């Protein structure tokens, strides 16, 4: 329910807490910045209310930077963390997304060929802008120049407030209340998310199949209680065959989930 009026408002940098150093370097280049907890990414800009109850209504600009140093980049890719990490950045509602890469030492942990490929995959496929800096202080100098451009890019534009339901210098932005809490529940694991993911640990269970089971029984207590109420074991062996399975909308596959979920003996 917010407007930021062009006559005065504040364009400033928000930095994540985990940068423990860049905080020494960034104050020298006269960059107006605060330090905050950010739930996706490492760097973000907001439009503060300039003179509000010492509580600014804040609209968040359409720009996010995630900084992986190259040592921790190799770590985060070799354990499968990387694809989950970019996907969170891809689904955050700030859609001009930058991926900042610091050298910090020697290049040879993973080879040259495979690291350049994944960065260029992030450049091409994942849609990110890649900046490559050599140390901590070049990237801070980059973010200094990146900040003074975003002040000049939004000068005299009038800014309004989107809901979480969704060139040009982009006004009608999310608010910072909607951004963080929206980023909270992107990565937050729900009961439905796990129970869908758990169902497809069985050979023969697929994405349209598991979401059909989740459409019928939203929580794992309800699948067990449906098994509880049906009387003979032939019913529980044939409970699940009549689900709305697919885009199109398994008889013996209702059998093998009941073997998981009705056996009070141990499994094998």
């Amino acid at each position: 329910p917010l407007e930021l009026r062009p006559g005065e408002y504040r364009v400033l940098l928000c930095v994540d807490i985990g940068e423990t150093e860049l905080l020494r370097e960034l104050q020298r280049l006269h960059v107006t910045h605060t330090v905050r907890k950010l739930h996706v990414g490492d760097f973000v800009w907001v439009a503060q209310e300039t003179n509000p109850p010492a509580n600014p209504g804040e609209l968040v600009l359409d720009h996010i930077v995630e900084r992986k140093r190259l040592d921790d980049l190799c770590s985060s890719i070799i354990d499968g963390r990387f694809r989950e990490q970019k996907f969170r950045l891809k689904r955050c509602g700030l859609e001009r997304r930058v991926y900042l890469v610091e050298e910090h030492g020697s290049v040879h942990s993973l080879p040259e060929s495979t690291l350049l490929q994944a960065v260029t995959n992030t450049q091409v496929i994942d849609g990110f802008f890649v900046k490559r800096t050599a140390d901590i202080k070049e990237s801070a100098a980059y973010l200094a120049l990146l900040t003074r451009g975003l002040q000049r890019l939004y000068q005299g534009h009038t800014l309004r407030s989107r809901p979480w339901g969704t060139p040009n210098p982009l006004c009608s932005l999310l608010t910072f209340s909607d951004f963080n809490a929206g980023a909270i529940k992107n990565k937050a694991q729900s009961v439905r998310e796990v129970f869908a993911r758990q169902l497809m640990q069985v050979r023969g269970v697929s994405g349209e199949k598991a979401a059909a089971l989740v459409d019928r029984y939203s929580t794992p207590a309800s699948l067990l209680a449906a098994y509880d109420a049906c009387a003979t074991p032939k019913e529980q062996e044939t409970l699940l065959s009549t689900i709305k399975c697919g885009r199109l909308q398994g008889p013996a596959l209702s059998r093998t989930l009941s073997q998981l979920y009705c056996s009070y003996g141990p499994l094998t």
Partner: protein, 282 residues
């Protein structure tokens, strides 16, 4: 209906169209040496901006049956002389683009050798600001390299990126909203379900497979774990049922356990009736 298009069988459908005026530098052959070894199609033919190269992905020849192969141009690198580059840096004190169909790109070979022998009009921080101005206005990167090999490294990396793109989009879309990848085989008598149930615990966040095996050793069926939770009197016993279960210590003699956070998450997984309940935040 097998119907498979891997990265290695659409790189055949990838085509790189490189302008003939690239060749007036005799070090440009390094590209051709490297991008013929990759199995993409090479086209040496005159281009829509001159001294530029663009990419071309077209749909395969029998052609089925889903709907999008992402065919069209979709990338274009415009190569620049450093003094032609430094003109536009001086333009962005107070626009090297036409408007064509694909995603635009710039490269300049050997810039820091060039600014040394001329300067050491404008210098390096004028360039550094202009890269940020090219970033913000027009989403536009300029690839500053120091050889034709480094140019060719990136040109091949773009080309392997455009072959892997249609694989990745058909698992990005057409996967329902929990994926972020196969199933354990089960016989007639179950008998592989324990290794599936072991992996179901591993589908919680922050769970090492050593931790997941400690859950299932204690409680080898789902009904054996709900029966243990319902035998507890207080809710604290339910939330700490799996907490005291021993774990491999992992590189230091300090012994580990499963611990209370996972033990409460499993407890209010099976006991809750709220599917929108967040087990954790992160």
């Amino acid at each position: 209906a097998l119907r498979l298009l891997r990265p290695e069988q659409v790189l055949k459908r990838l085509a790189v169209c490189v302008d003939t005026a690239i060749l007036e530098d005799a070090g440009a052959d390094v590209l051709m040496e490297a991008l013929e070894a990759l199995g993409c199609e090479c086209r040496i033919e005159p281009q829509r901006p001159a001294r530029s190269l663009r990419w071309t992905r077209a749909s395969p020849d029998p052609c089925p049956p889903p709907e999008v192969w992402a065919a069209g141009e979709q990338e274009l690198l415009l190569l620049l002389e450093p003094e032609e580059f430094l003109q536009g840096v001086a333009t962005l004190t107070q626009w090297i683009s036409p408007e064509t169909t694909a995603r635009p790109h710039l490269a300049v070979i050997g810039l820091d050798a060039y600014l040394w022998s001329r300067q050491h009009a404008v210098s390096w921080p004028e360039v550094e600001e202009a890269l940020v101005l090219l970033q913000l206005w027009a989403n536009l990167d300029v690839l500053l390299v120091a050889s034709w090999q480094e140019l060719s490294r990136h040109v091949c990396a773009v080309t392997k990126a455009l072959a892997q793109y249609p694989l990745k989009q058909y698992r990005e879309s057409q996967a329902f909203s929990f994926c972020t990848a196969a199933g354990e085989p089960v016989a007639r008598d179950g008998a592989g379900l324990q290794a599936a149930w072991r992996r179901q615990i591993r589908q919680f966040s922050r769970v090492s497979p050593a931790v997941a095996d400690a859950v299932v050793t204690a409680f080898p069926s789902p009904r054996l774990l709900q029966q243990a939770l319902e035998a507890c009197s207080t809710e604290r016993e339910r939330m700490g049922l799996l907490a005291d279960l021993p774990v491999p210590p992992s590189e230091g003699g300090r012994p580990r356990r499963v611990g209370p956070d996972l033990s409460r998450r499993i407890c209010l997984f099976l006991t809750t009736a709220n599917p929108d309940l967040l087990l954790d935040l992160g």
